[PDB]
Amino acid sequence: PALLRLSDHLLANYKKGVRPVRDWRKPTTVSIDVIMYAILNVDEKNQVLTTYIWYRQYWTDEFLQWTPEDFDNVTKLSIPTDSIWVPDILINEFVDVGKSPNIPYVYVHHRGEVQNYKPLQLVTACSLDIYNFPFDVQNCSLTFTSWLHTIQDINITLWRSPEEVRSDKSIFINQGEWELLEVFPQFKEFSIDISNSYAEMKFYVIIRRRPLFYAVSLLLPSIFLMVVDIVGFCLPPDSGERVSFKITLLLGYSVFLIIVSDTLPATAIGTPLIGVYFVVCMALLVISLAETIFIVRLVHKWLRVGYVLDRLLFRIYLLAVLAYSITLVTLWSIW
Amino acid sequence: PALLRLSDHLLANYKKGVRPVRDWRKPTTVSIDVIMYAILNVDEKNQVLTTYIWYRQYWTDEFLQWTPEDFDNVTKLSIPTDSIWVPDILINEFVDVGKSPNIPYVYVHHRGEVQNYKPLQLVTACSLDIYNFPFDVQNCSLTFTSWLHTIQDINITLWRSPEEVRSDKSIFINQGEWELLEVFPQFKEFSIDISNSYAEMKFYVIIRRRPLFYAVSLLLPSIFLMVVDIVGFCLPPDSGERVSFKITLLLGYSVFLIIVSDTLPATAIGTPLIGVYFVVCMALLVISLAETIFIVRLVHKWLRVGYVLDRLLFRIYLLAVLAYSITLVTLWSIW
Amino acid sequence: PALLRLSDHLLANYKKGVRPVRDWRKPTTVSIDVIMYAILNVDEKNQVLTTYIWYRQYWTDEFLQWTPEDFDNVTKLSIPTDSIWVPDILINEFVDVGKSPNIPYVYVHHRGEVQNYKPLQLVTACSLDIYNFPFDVQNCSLTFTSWLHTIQDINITLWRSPEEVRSDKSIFINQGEWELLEVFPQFKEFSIDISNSYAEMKFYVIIRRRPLFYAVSLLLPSIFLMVVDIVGFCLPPDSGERVSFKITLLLGYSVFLIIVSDTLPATAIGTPLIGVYFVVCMALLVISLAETIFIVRLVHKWLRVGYVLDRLLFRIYLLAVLAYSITLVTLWSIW
Amino acid sequence: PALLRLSDHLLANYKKGVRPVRDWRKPTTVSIDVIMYAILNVDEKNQVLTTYIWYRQYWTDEFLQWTPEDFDNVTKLSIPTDSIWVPDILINEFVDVGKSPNIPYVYVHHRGEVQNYKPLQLVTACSLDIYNFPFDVQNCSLTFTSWLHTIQDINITLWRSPEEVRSDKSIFINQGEWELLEVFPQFKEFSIDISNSYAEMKFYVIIRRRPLFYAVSLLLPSIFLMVVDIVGFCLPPDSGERVSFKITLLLGYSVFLIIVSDTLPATAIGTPLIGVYFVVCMALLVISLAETIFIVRLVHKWLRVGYVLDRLLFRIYLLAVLAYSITLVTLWSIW
Amino acid sequence: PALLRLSDHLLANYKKGVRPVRDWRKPTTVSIDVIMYAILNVDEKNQVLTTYIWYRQYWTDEFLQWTPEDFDNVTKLSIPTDSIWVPDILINEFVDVGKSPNIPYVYVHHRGEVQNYKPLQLVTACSLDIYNFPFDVQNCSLTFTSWLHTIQDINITLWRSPEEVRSDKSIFINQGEWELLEVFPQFKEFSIDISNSYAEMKFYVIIRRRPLFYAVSLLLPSIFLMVVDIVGFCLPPDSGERVSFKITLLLGYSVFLIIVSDTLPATAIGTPLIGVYFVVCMALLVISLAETIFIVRLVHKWLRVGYVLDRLLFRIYLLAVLAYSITLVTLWSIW
Numbered sequence A, B, C, D, E: 001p002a003l004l005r006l007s008d009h010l011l012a013n014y015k016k017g018v019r020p021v022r023d024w025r026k027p028t029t030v031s032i033d034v035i036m037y038a039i040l041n042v043d044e045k046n047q048v049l050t051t052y053i054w055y056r057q058y059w060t061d062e063f064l065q066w067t068p069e070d071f072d073n074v075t076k077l078s079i080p081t082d083s084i085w086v087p088d089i090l091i092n093e094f095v096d097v098g099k100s101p102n103i104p105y106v107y108v109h110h111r112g113e114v115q116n117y118k119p120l121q122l123v124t125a126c127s128l129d130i131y132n133f134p135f136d137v138q139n140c141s142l143t144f145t146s147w148l149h150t151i152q153d154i155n156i157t158l159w160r161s162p163e164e165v166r167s168d169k170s171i172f173i174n175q176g177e178w179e180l181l182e183v184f185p186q187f188k189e190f191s192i193d194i195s196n197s198y199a200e201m202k203f204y205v206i207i208r209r210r211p212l213f214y215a216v217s218l219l220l221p222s223i224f225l226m227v228v229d230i231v232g233f234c235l236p237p238d239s240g241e242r243v244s245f246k247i248t249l250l251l252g253y254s255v256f257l258i259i260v261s262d263t264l265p266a267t268a269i270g271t272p273l274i275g276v277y278f279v280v281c282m283a284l285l286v287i288s289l290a291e292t293i294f295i296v297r298l299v300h301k302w303l304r305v306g307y308v309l310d311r312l313l314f315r316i317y318l319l320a321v322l323a324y325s326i327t328l329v330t331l332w333s334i335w
C-alpha cells in the first residue's frame, strides 16, 4: 500500500513536543490571514463583539520532508493535528473560545510546508465607540499573537499581499446587521519588558452600521415626541389642563432615556449624541412647565404679556430643532 | 471466539491518521442525507436558528475489507469511532456545536462500506427574512462541507434519490411553532481561490410559520387599537377632554412599537410590513391631534366648518384601514 | 492479593471495541428502568422540559464470566466504565446532555450480568399542551433508544414489572412546582425504513400542575379586573368622565395579554382557554366604549332610552361571567 | 534520587481499576467534612441554590503502604489523582457540576491514609420555603452519597467531631446576601429496595436572610402605598375626581403583584405572607371603589348617610393595618 | 539533529507525578505576578466580578537541568505542559474557570528555571461595596493559593519588586467602564487548623468607576424629578387638580426605585446613598399630598392660613436639596 507507508515513514520518530527545526537560531515563521465571514452580534452594553472568521496558517517544518519519488508521486497528505506540532498562537482579546470545533486534520507538502485550516469564533473585547449611535463607525482590533514563544522562536507574517486582505469581500453575510468597509492588517513588534519581544500581528477590522432599521423605529419616534408639544404649544396656555397635557409627557419621557441608558454602555467618553439630544429636549420642555404654571399664578384673583413672554419660549424650540437637522446631515455626511 | 477475532484481524495495523484508500488519486466519496426532526427556536433578534437533525453517512474504506468466510458469516460489525478514520465534515453556518453527544460506534460491511449515524444540533446562522412577519416563509441554508480536504481527497454526494429527501415527513414534531414545506438538496462546487476546490453540498431547508397564535394575541390587539379612535372620533371634537382622550393613546402606542422593535432584528432590508403598519397608523393619528387642538384655538373668544375640515380627516382613516384588509389577504394568498 | 488478581485475569484481553457475545446471532438485550426524581422547570415558551432521572441498566456480557472459586468467593466487583463495553443508548428528545456527570464505575457478577447506574438530566423537547393553562395535564415522552445498533445487535426491555414503574413514588421532590400521577412505560418497535429496525422503549411520563400559586396571583387578579367595570357600570353613563374611567382600563388591559403572550408559546393548536377569556372580556368592554360615547353624542344640543339600550349591554356582562364559572368547574372536574 | 524512587516503587503495579483493599469483606470507609465558604445566589424562581464549598476526604488504602525507612524518612507524598483510585461519591441534588476545576493531586501517608482536597460548586436543588419572604429561614439539604457502591463496598463517616462542623465560622463571606446559623450533619442509611443499601450522609445546612435591603426598598414602599389612600380617604367622597384618584392606584397596583409573582416561585404551599398582604389590601380597596361610586349615584337628581356608611369602611382599613403590625413583629420574633 | 536530542535526553525518565526536587525538605518555591489587562463587567446584583489577567510563573525544577555544551549552546527550550510537572495553584474566589484556554507550552532554562505563561479569566466573587454608588471605590481580592500543597511542599513569592506591580499601567484597556488606581500585592501565611499551613499570596486590586455616563443619564434625571414639584408647588394649592398633578408623580416614582432595587444587590450594609436619597425625597413629597388634601377639606362649605402652614412645607424641600449638594461634593472629594 502506498499512502500509509508514508505516514509510517514520516511520523515514526516525530517527537511532537519540539518546535521543529534543524537549526535552532532560525525562527520558524508562521504565516496566516483572515477571511471574515460574518458579524454575529454587537452587544454594546457588555463591551464585547462576537465574530466568525475563516482562518488559515502555514509554517515551514523541516522534519516532515520526504521525496515524491518512492511514494508514487504523492505531494499532499493529511495528518492528525495532535500527532504533530502546532504553534501556540491565540488572540489577546478573547472572552471565551470553546465555540470553535477542533479541526482534526492538516495538510503537508514535500517541502515541509504544513498547512492548517480551522474556523474560530471570538467573543472579542474591543473598546467600541458609541459617539454617534445610529451611524457609528467601529474600529475593532484582533491581535493574533504568539502567547508564549518569542521572536527567536517564531515570527508572524502574512499569507498573501496585504492589499488583497483589504477589500476581501469574497464571502460575507450581508443583510444581517452590520457591513464592513475593509479589513486592515498591520504588523507590530511587541515588547512589554526588557530582554523579551513577542511576535504580534494586528487586524484593524472596521465595520459600520446600517441605520435603516433604527430610521423608522428609533428616531422617527423621536420626531413625534418632539412635534407633539410644538402643536401642543399652539393652544393658549390658560386652558388649565396644560399641565396634565404636559407632565404626562415628562416622566413618560424619563422611561425613554432609562430604557436606552440600560441598553447603552457605561463608557465615559460620552453619552451618544442621539442620546444627548432627547435629554436636552427634556431639559427645555421642563422649563416650559414653569412657564405654563407661572401664568396661572399670574392669572389669579398682564394676560397679553403672558402670551409673549411664552412666545419667546417658542423660539427656544425651533432653535433646537433647526440645530438638530444639521447634526443628522453632518452624520449622514460621515459614511 | 468469533467476533473479536475479526477486530483483532481488522484493526491490527489500521493507522487511523490516513485517509484510507489503495490508490490516492481516487477521492474517497462520502455520502450523506438529513432527516429533519424538529425546529427548536427561531430567535429573530439574534439572527440564529437552532435545529435538531438526524444524520447519516457512508464512505468506501478499502482497508476495512474482510471476507464473511473464516468469520462465521459476519457481514455487519460495530467499531469505536476514534479507532478508525472519520471525514472532517462540518457545517459552514454553525455557532456552537457542543450540544451534540458523541456517538461512539459505527458499522462496517464486508465491502468496506463503513456506515455512521449521529445526531447533531446546530444553532445555525442563516439570514432570515422578516418582510411579512406573521406569515413569513424562511429560506435557510445548511452547507455541509469538507472543512479541510479538497476535491482530490473527498467528494460529497447524496445517499438516496433527491426527490425522497424533498417530501420527507417521516419523523417531524408538529404542534410546535413552525412547519416546513420541503427540504431542498443541491450540490454546489465551491472554489474560493485558484488551485483549490472544496466539496460542498447545500441544504435549502424552507419553513413557514403557523400564524394562529399571533392571530388572537398580536394583530387582534392591533384591531381594537385601530377601532378605539374611530368610534373615539364620533363624539364632536369640542369636548375639551378630546386631547386627554387622545394623547394617552399616542405615547401609549410608542411602547407598542418599542417592545416589538427590541424584539425584531436590525436587518435593514425592512421593518416588517405588520410593523410598518402600526407606525403609519401612529403617523396619521398624530395629525388628528393637531386637528383637535386647532379647533379649540378656533373656538375661542366657524364652528360648523371645524366639523367638516375634520370630517375629511375621517376619510383618511378608512382610506388606511381599507388599504389594510387587502395586505392581509395578499399575504393570506402567499402560503 | 485477591481482588486485583481478578481484574488482571478478567480484563487481560477484553477488547472493548466489540459488542461482547459468544454467538453473534443472539442480540445482547439491555434492560433498564427509570426512577423519576424531580421536575426542574417547564418553560412553556421554549418548548422544552428539564428532568432529573435516576437511571439503571444491566446486560448479559459473557466475556466477563469467572467462577467465585479461585477468587475467595467474590461475586460482585467494580470496573471502570471506559475499560469495558457500554451500549450506545441515548434519548431521541434531548437538547443538551452535558449536565450529567460521568459515573466512572460499574458492577459485574459471576454470571456476567454487568450492572450500571448513572444519573442523567435532560432538557427534553416534548410538545406540551397549553389548552387549559392553570390546570394542564402534560403528556411528555422519553424514548430511550439505541442510536446506532439494530434489533439483531441489541434489544431493549424493562428491569422490573411494568406495574411497579407505574406508581413508583419512592423518591420524588414534591412542594416544587409539579406533581405527577404515573409513569407509563411501553415498548415500541421502530423502523423508519426497509431492512432496518431499531430498538426503542418509550416512557410516557405524565405530570399535572398545582394551580394554587396561580389561584391567588393570576386569576384572582382576573376577578377584579372583571368586577371593576361592573360596579364601574353602575354610575349613570352621562358623567362625562366615563371614557376616562374606561379607556384607562382598555390599553391598560393590552399589557395584560402582551405580558402573557410573550410568556406563553406560539403553538397554533390554541391560545389557552384562560388566555382566550380575558381577550374576549376585552372584546366586549370595547363595544361598551361605543355605548358610552354614542350617548354623549345623543345628549347634545331620548335620555331614558340611553339608559335601557345600555341596560341590555349590562346583560352581556353576566352572560359572559356566568358562562365563566362553568369553565373553571369543568376544569376543576378534570384533575 | 529519593522522591521519585518512591513513586516508581509505589505505582509500579497499582491497578487503578480496583477498589483497593486486602480483604474484600471489609468496606473501605471514606470520611469527609465540609467547610462552607459562601452562598452565591438563591434564585427562588428557578428552585435552585448555588453554593461554594471547601471539601475534604480521606480513606484507608492498604496498597499504598510503604515504610519511611529506605526512603529518607518521607511520610507525605503527592500523587496525581487519575493515577490512583478515587471513590465515586457525588451529590444527589446537583444540577450542573462543570464549574468545579479538577484538583490534580492528592496526599498519601505511610499508613496508607490517602488524603484528598478539592473545591466544588453546586447549583443544588432543595425545596426552599417561601412562607415568610423577607424573614425566611431555609432548610436546605446536601446528601453526599456513593452513587454506585454499597455498604459492603464503601461506607461514609465524618472527619471530625460533629459539634465542630456545627458552629464552623472559620471562613465565610458575610456582607453578601445571606448568613447561616449552623451546618447540621447527620448520617442516614439509605435503602431504596431489597438486597441493596447505599451509604449516604446528609448535610442540613440552614441559612437565613438579612432583611435590611428589602426593609427600605420593598416593604417601605408597601407603607406609603397603604398610607396614600388613608389620607386619600380624608377628602369628602363627593369630589367626583375620587374615582380618578382611586382607580389609578388599582390597576397600578396590579403591576406590583405581577412583577413579584413572576419573581417568586410556583410552589403551592403558599403565596408568601408579605405577598398575600398586599393582595388583600387590594381586595379591600376595590370595595371602596364601589362605595365612592354608589354615593355618586345616590347624590343624583341622604348625603349625611353616605358619610357614615363609608366611615365604617374606614374602620376596615385600620382593622387591617393594625392586624399587620403584629405579623411583622411575630416574624421579627422568629430570627 | 540538535533540538530533539535534548528532549529525548531530558524527558526520558521524567516521572511527571512527582513534585520535582533532589532534597524533599526544601520547598519548591513558585513565583508569580499579575499584569491586569481589563475589567470586563461588574454585575453588582450577582455579587461577582469578571477579570482578564495576564499571568506568569516560574519555579526551580532540578530534574530538568542540562548543560548548554553538548547541545550546541541551547539555553531556552519549549516543552508541552502536560509532559512535565505543574503546581496546583488556583484562586480561592472563582466561580467558573472554563473560559481560559490551555496554553500547551512552557519554557525551561539550563538552570532548571521552568517558566510558564498563561492567561486566565476569573468570574471572581469579592464582596463589593455599594455605599456610594456613582463614585464607588472597590476593594476586591484575588488570593492565589496552593489548593493542596503545604508550606513544606511549595511556597509562593513574587516575581519582581512589589512596587513595580503597584503602578503597573503598561497594558490596560481604558475607555471601558472602570479605571484602577493600583494593584496591591501582599503575602499572607494561611493556616485554617493545627498542623497545617498553606501558602497564599493575595492581590488587593482596587478599582473606581468613571461617573460620567451616570452623570447625564442617572442623577440628572434625579434633578428634574426633584425640580418638577418645586415649581409644581408654586401654583396655589387650591386648584383641585393638584392631587392629579401630584399622585401621578408618586406611584410613578415607585417604579424608579423598584427598577434600581432589582438592579442593585441585597447587601445589608446599606442601600446606596444615591438610592437612599430619592426614597427620602419620596418620603417628604408624600406628606405634601396630605397638605394638599387637608386644605381642600378645610376649604369646604382660614384660606390665608393654608397658604402659610404649607409655606413651611416648602422650607422642608430646600432643607433637603441644600443638604444634597454637600453629599455630592463630599463624594466628589473622595476620588
Ligand SMILES: *[C@@H]1O[C@H](CO)[C@@H](O[C@@H]2O[C@H](CO)[C@@H](O)[C@H](O)[C@H]2NC(C)=O)[C@H](O)[C@H]1NC(C)=O
Pocket: A139, A184, A204, A206
Ligand atoms: C483604527 O485605529 C488605529 C489606531 O490604533 C489606526 O491606526 C493608525 O493608522 C494610521 C494610518 O496608517 C497610522 O498612520 C497610525 O500610525 C496608526 N496608529 C496606530 C496606533 O496603529 C487605524 O487607522 C484605525 N482604522 C482605520 C480604518 O482608520
Ligand SMILES: *[C@@H]1O[C@H](CO)[C@@H](O[C@@H]2O[C@H](CO)[C@@H](O)[C@H](O)[C@H]2NC(C)=O)[C@H](O)[C@H]1NC(C)=O
Pocket: A027, A151, A155, A156, A157, A158, A187
Ligand atoms: C519578523 O517578521 C517581520 C514581518 O512579519 C519581518 O519584517 C520584515 O523585515 C524585512 C527586513 O528586516 C523586510 O524586508 C520585510 O519587508 C519586513 N516585512 C514586513 C511585513 O514589514 C521581521 O524582520 C521578522 N523578524 C525576524 C527576527 O525574523
Ligand SMILES: *[C@@H]1O[C@H](CO)[C@@H](O[C@@H]2O[C@H](CO)[C@@H](O)[C@H](O)[C@H]2NC(C)=O)[C@H](O)[C@H]1NC(C)=O
Pocket: B139, B184, B204, B206
Ligand atoms: C432559496 O434561495 C435559493 C437562492 O440562494 C434558491 O435557489 C435557486 O433555486 C432555483 C430553482 O432551482 C434555481 O434556478 C436558482 O439557480 C437557485 N439559485 C441559487 C443561488 O441557488 C432556492 O430555490 C430558494 N428556496 C426555495 C424553496 O425556493
Ligand SMILES: *[C@@H]1O[C@H](CO)[C@@H](O[C@@H]2O[C@H](CO)[C@@H](O)[C@H](O)[C@H]2NC(C)=O)[C@H](O)[C@H]1NC(C)=O
Pocket: B027, B151, B155, B156, B157, B158, B187
Ligand atoms: C463529485 O461529486 C459530484 C456529485 O456529488 C459529481 O457530479 C456527478 O458527475 C457525474 C459526471 O461528471 C454525473 O454523471 C453525475 O450525475 C453528477 N452527480 C450529480 C449529483 O450532479 C462530480 O463529478 C464529482 N467530482 C469528482 C471529481 O469526483
Ligand SMILES: *[C@@H]1O[C@H](CO)[C@@H](O[C@@H]2O[C@H](CO)[C@@H](O)[C@H](O)[C@H]2NC(C)=O)[C@H](O)[C@H]1NC(C)=O
Pocket: C139, C184, C204, C206
Ligand atoms: C399519552 O399519549 C399517548 C399517545 O401517543 C397515549 O398512548 C395511547 O395509550 C392508549 C392506552 O393504552 C393506547 O390504546 C393507544 O394505542 C396509545 N397510543 C399511542 C400512539 O401510543 C397515552 O395513553 C397518553 N398518556 C396517558 C397517561 O393517557
Ligand SMILES: *[C@@H]1O[C@H](CO)[C@@H](O[C@@H]2O[C@H](CO)[C@@H](O)[C@H](O)[C@H]2NC(C)=O)[C@H](O)[C@H]1NC(C)=O
Pocket: C027, C151, C155, C156, C157, C158, C187
Ligand atoms: C425484543 O424485546 C421485546 C421486549 O422488550 C420482545 O418482545 C417480547 O416477545 C416475546 C415473544 O416474541 C413475548 O413473550 C414477550 O412478552 C415480549 N415482551 C414484551 C415486553 O412485549 C421482542 O420479542 C424482542 N425481539 C427480539 C428479536 O429479541
Ligand SMILES: *[C@@H]1O[C@H](CO)[C@@H](O[C@@H]2O[C@H](CO)[C@@H](O)[C@H](O)[C@H]2NC(C)=O)[C@H](O)[C@H]1NC(C)=O
Pocket: D139, D184, D204, D206
Ligand atoms: C431541617 O429539616 C429536617 C427534616 O427533614 C430536620 O431533621 C429533623 O431533626 C430533628 C432534630 O434532631 C429530628 O428529631 C428529626 O428526626 C429530623 N427529621 C428528619 C426527617 O431528618 C432538621 O432538624 C431541620 N433543620 C433544622 C436546623 O431544624
Ligand SMILES: *[C@@H]1O[C@H](CO)[C@@H](O[C@@H]2O[C@H](CO)[C@@H](O)[C@H](O)[C@H]2NC(C)=O)[C@H](O)[C@H]1NC(C)=O
Pocket: D027, D151, D155, D156, D157, D158, D187
Ligand atoms: C457505616 O458507618 C456508620 C457511621 O458512619 C456506622 O455507624 C456506627 O456504628 C457503630 C456500631 O455499629 C457505632 O459505634 C458508631 O457510633 C456509629 N457511628 C455513627 C456516626 O453513628 C455503621 O456501623 C457503618 N456500617 C458498616 C457496615 O460499616
Ligand SMILES: *[C@@H]1O[C@H](CO)[C@@H](O[C@@H]2O[C@H](CO)[C@@H](O)[C@H](O)[C@H]2NC(C)=O)[C@H](O)[C@H]1NC(C)=O
Pocket: E139, E184, E204, E206
Ligand atoms: C483593602 O482592604 C484591606 C483589608 O482587608 C486593606 O488591607 C490593610 O492594609 C493596611 C495598609 O497596609 C494594613 O495596615 C492592614 O493591616 C491591612 N489589613 C488587612 C486585613 O489586610 C487594604 O489596604 C485595602 N486596600 C486599599 C487600597 O486600601
Ligand SMILES: *[C@@H]1O[C@H](CO)[C@@H](O[C@@H]2O[C@H](CO)[C@@H](O)[C@H](O)[C@H]2NC(C)=O)[C@H](O)[C@H]1NC(C)=O
Pocket: E027, E151, E155, E156, E157, E158, E187
Ligand atoms: C515562604 O515565602 C515567604 C515569602 O514569599 C518567606 O518570607 C520571607 O522570609 C525571609 C526570612 O524568613 C525574609 O528575609 C523575606 O523578606 C520574606 N519575604 C517576604 C516577601 O516577606 C517565607 O520565609 C517562606 N517560608 C518558607 C518556609 O520557605
Ligand SMILES: *[C@@H]1O[C@H](CO)[C@@H](O)[C@H](O)[C@H]1NC(C)=O
Pocket: A072, A073
Ligand atoms: C512520477 O512523476 C515523475 C515526474 O512527474 C514521472 O517522470 C514519473 O513517471 C512518475 N511516476 C509515477 C509512478 O507516477
Ligand SMILES: *[C@@H]1O[C@H](CO)[C@@H](O)[C@H](O)[C@H]1NC(C)=O
Pocket: B072, B073
Ligand atoms: C455461510 O454462508 C454460506 C452462504 O450463505 C453457507 O454456504 C455456509 O454454510 C455458511 N456457513 C456458516 C458456518 O454459517
Ligand SMILES: NCCc1c[nH]c2ccc(O)cc12
Pocket: A035, A053, A054, A055, A056, A117, A118, A119, B145, B146, B147, B148, B190, B192, B198, B199
Ligand atoms: N471548504 C472551505 C475551506 C476553505 C476554503 N478557503 C478557506 C479559507 C479560510 C478558511 O479558514 C477555510 C477555507
Ligand SMILES: NCCc1c[nH]c2ccc(O)cc12
Pocket: B035, B053, B054, B055, B056, B117, B118, B119, C145, C146, C147, C148, C190, C192, C198, C199
Ligand atoms: N434509532 C434510530 C436510528 C436511526 C434510524 N434511522 C435514522 C436516520 C438518521 C439518523 O441520524 C438516525 C437514524
Ligand SMILES: NCCc1c[nH]c2ccc(O)cc12
Pocket: C035, C053, C054, C055, C056, C117, C118, C119, D145, D146, D147, D148, D190, D192, D198, D199
Ligand atoms: N445511592 C443511590 C444509588 C441508587 C439506588 N437506587 C437507585 C436507582 C436508580 C439509580 O440511578 C441509582 C440508584
Ligand SMILES: NCCc1c[nH]c2ccc(O)cc12
Pocket: D035, D053, D054, D055, D056, D117, D118, D119, E145, E146, E147, E148, E190, E192, E198, E199
Ligand atoms: N489552601 C487551603 C487548603 C485547605 C485548607 N483547609 C481546607 C479545608 C477544606 C478544603 O477543601 C481545602 C482546605
